[PDB]
């Protein structure tokens, strides 16, 4: 039962250097194993980074060789990963894993066995933008019912709460989860289903609260 435990900074500034460590339990670094690193961008798939053997030999991702540096530490039973010139495109959940090394006749690097142990993952966010208040734009208008909403654009960080008519309108409200743009800013949309005959006599107001920027917005959605 080999166990792995990675540790990271969590929050990182752009153009910096990412330094990750992975503690190995139940196994030694000097064993016949390849210590891998794998990351997964938000909403995307897995991406192999590289692996290192205890003798120093490494194998890196061809599109990231110049920015990847891996090392091992035998007195601490750990192996590390160093990524330089980090941008917002490197924001991902990073895992450390291991796989058994195989050989044929003499000691050799044959790749028969595969990955069998995974870590717990560590979140690394590259803050490409600072704290920014949200920009609320109206989404002005299904036969008997109509759809109207508010576009909460370009805010940071994540916590944002949206209500309609000071929380009085709760049926027919659907708040979509926010999208993480490449610029480091978030954006979501909250839409409500209302009777189409009341669009001329009933007013609807979308209440946005963004505590990290201490900004509260009430936006009236007109028929337009």
């Amino acid at each position: 039962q080999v166990q792995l435990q990675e540790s990271g900074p969590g929050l990182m500034k752009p153009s910096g250097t990412l330094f990750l460590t992975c503690a190995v339990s139940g196994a030694s670094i000097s064993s016949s194993n390849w210590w891998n690193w794998v990351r997964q961008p938000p909403g995307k798939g897995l991406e192999w980074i590289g692996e290192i053997y205890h003798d120093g030999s490494v194998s890196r991702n061809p599109f990231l060789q110049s920015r990847i540096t891996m090392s091992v530490d035998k007195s601490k039973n750990q192996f590390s990963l160093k990524l330089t010139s980090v941008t917002a495109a490197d924001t991902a959940v990073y895992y450390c894993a291991k796989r058994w090394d195989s050989s044929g006749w003499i000691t050799r690097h044959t790749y028969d066995y595969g990955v069998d142990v995974w870590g717990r993952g560590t979140s690394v966010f590259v803050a490409s933008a600072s704290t920014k208040g949200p920009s609320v734009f109206p989404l002005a208008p299904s036969g008997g019912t109509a759809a109207l909403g508010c576009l909460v654009k370009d805010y940071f960080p994540e916590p944002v709460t949206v209500s309609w008519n000071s929380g009085a309108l709760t049926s027919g409200v659907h708040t979509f989860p926010a999208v993480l743009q490449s610029s480091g800013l978030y954006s979501l949309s909250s839409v409500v289903t209302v009777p189409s005959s009341s669009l001329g006599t009933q007013t609807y107001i979308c209440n946005v609260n963004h505590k990290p920027s201490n900004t509260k917005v009430d936006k009236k959605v007109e028929p337009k």
Partner: protein, 212 residues
């Protein structure tokens, strides 16, 4: 590294059989690639299933099996259980490096398929005076939670300025997603129309807005 290709999404009934493929852009997949298969539940750490074509780990159930079928590495599931639902990735070795595939979203249908309702909003007049323009394409009430969104200006496909979320589970066990197209005010006026194409289970829905 090559370009590993998997199915975007596949479905299977509880107790049925399904096969996931794993292709390479360099040609046929021999045993020298040593293909591995991993399963990732939503929010969990990916779990190892098959290593080197057709070898199970101590925790892989007997329902899973791997092989090489017509130049592709294949993972076969017999007797589908709702626990097997997740994202399956294949890892192959080529030119001294490991390459992951795009992944396949496998859904074990606990209920019939649901079609999505799509609403497309044009840019508001307030945003144009802020010298910005954003198209909001909202998707909801679709099952399973696998969808493909594409944008077109006039008759030409659009990929620059597009950002889309992944499906999230609603309260009624359905899924929702949204896509955004950031444009300049001059681009919004230099085209006759913009559309949001939503493809789900082979059925496509396309909404269109126009500046005039």
């Amino acid at each position: 590294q090559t370009v590993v290709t998997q199915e975007p999404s596949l479905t299977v009934s509880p107790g049925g059989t399904v096969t996931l493929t794993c292709a390479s852009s360099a040609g046929a997949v021999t045993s020298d690639f040593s293909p591995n298969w991993f399963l990732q539940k939503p929010g969990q750490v990916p779990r190892s299933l098959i290593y080197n074509t057709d070898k199970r780990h101590s925790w892989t159930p007997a329902r899973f099996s791997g092989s090489l079928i017509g130049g592709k590495a294949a993972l076969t599931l017999s007797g589908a259980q709702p626990d097997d639902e997740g994202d399956y990735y294949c890892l192959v070795h080529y030119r001294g490096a490991w390459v992951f595939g795009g992944g396949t979203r496998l859904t074990v249908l606990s209920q019939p398929k649901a079609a999505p309702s799509v609403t497309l909003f044009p840019p508001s007049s307030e945003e144009l005076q802020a010298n910005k323009a954003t198209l909001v394409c909202l998707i909801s009430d679709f099952y399973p939670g696998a969808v493909t969104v594409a944008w077109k200006a006039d008759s030409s496909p659009v990929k620059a300025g597009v950002e889309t979320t992944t499906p999230s589970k609603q309260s009624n066990n359905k899924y929702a997603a949204s896509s955004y197209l950031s444009l300049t005010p001059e681009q919004w006026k230099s085209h006759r129309s913009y559309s949001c194409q939503v493809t789900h289970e082979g059925s496509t829905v396309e909404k269109t807005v126009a500046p005039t």
